[PDB]
């Protein structure tokens, strides 16, 4: 019942660029979701030790959280916006796989996703 190592947020070997779209994902998408009232269950990796969740990582093998994504975006870890969008989708999907549909945390992730989906529809040239 240890935690795995968090996901990579930094690799100096990967190449790096700034796009319109990556800047929108940090400053519009991430910022909006980050400041949401329901954001806090997702701002860090699920710590199964401190939270007593011994099944979490027997069930979730591709973990993701908005803290990781935030760091990835600050570190130019992403080259394509789609890599970033996929991490958000993995984070939502994980919440739907682990929690039962009717748990509070699923309703919370659904509100974030709706906001998330509204926001990426506004992603630029």
């Amino acid at each position: 019942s240890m935690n795995p190592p968090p996901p990579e947020t930094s690799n100096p070997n990967k190449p790096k660029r700034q796009t319109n779209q990556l800047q929108y994902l940090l400053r519009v998408v991430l910022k909006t979701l980050w400041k949401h009232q329901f954001a806090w269950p997702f701002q860090q990796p699920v710590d199964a030790v401190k939270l007593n969740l011994p099944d979490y990582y027997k069930i979730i093998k591709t973990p993701m959280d908005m803290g990781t994504i935030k760091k990835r975006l600050e570190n130019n870890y992403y080259w394509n916006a789609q890599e970033c969008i996929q991490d958000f989708n993995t984070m939502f999907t994980n919440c739907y796989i682990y929690n039962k549909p009717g748990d509070d945390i699923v309703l919370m992730a659904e509100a974030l996703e709706k906001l998330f989906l509204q926001k990426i529809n506004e992603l630029p040239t």
Binding site: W40, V46, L51, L53, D103
Partner: peptide, 8 residues
């Protein structure tokens, strides 16, 4: 905030 949002 005890079980970081999860239902026991």
């Amino acid at each position: 905030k005890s079980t970081g949002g999860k239902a026991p």
